Amino acid sequence: IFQINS
Amino acid sequence: IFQINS
Amino acid sequence: IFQINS
Amino acid sequence: IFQINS
Amino acid sequence: IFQINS
Amino acid sequence: IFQINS
Amino acid sequence: IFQINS
Amino acid sequence: IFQINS
Amino acid sequence: IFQINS
Amino acid sequence: IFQINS
């Protein structure tokens, strides 16, 4: 599980 | 579990 | 579990 | 468990 | 458990 | 510039 | 400039 | 400049 | 400049 | 300048 908000 | 908000 | 807010 | 707010 | 607020 | 290796 | 190796 | 090796 | 090795 | 080795 790998999650990014940018 | 890897989570980033930027 | 690795979590960052930036 | 590794947590950072910056 | 490693926690930082900066 | 946004770069990811996974 | 945002860079991640995972 | 934001850089992470994981 | 924000740098992390983990 | 914010630097962490873990």
From Swiss-Prot, chains A, B, C, D, E, F, G, H, I, J:
Cellular localisation? Secreted
Organism superkingdom: Eukaryota
Which disease is reported for it? Answer: Amyloidosis, hereditary systemic 5: A form of hereditary systemic amyloidosis, a disorder characterized by amyloid deposition in multiple tissues resulting in a wide clinical spectrum. AMYLD5 primarily affects the viscera, and the predominant clinical features are renal dysfunction of varying severity, and intra-abdominal bleeding. Inheritance is autosomal dominant.
Other facts? Lysozyme C is capable of both hydrolysis and transglycosylation; it also shows a slight esterase activity. It acts rapidly on both peptide-substituted and unsubstituted peptidoglycan, and slowly on chitin oligosaccharides.
Q: What does this protein do?
A: Lysozymes have primarily a bacteriolytic function; those in tissues and body fluids are associated with the monocyte-macrophage system and enhance the activity of immunoagents.
What is stated as this protein's family in its record?
A: Belongs to the glycosyl hydrolase 22 family.
Q: How does it assemble?
A: Monomer.
Q: What's the protein called, per UniProt?
A: Lysozyme C
Of the parent protein, the shown chain spans: 74 to 79 of 148
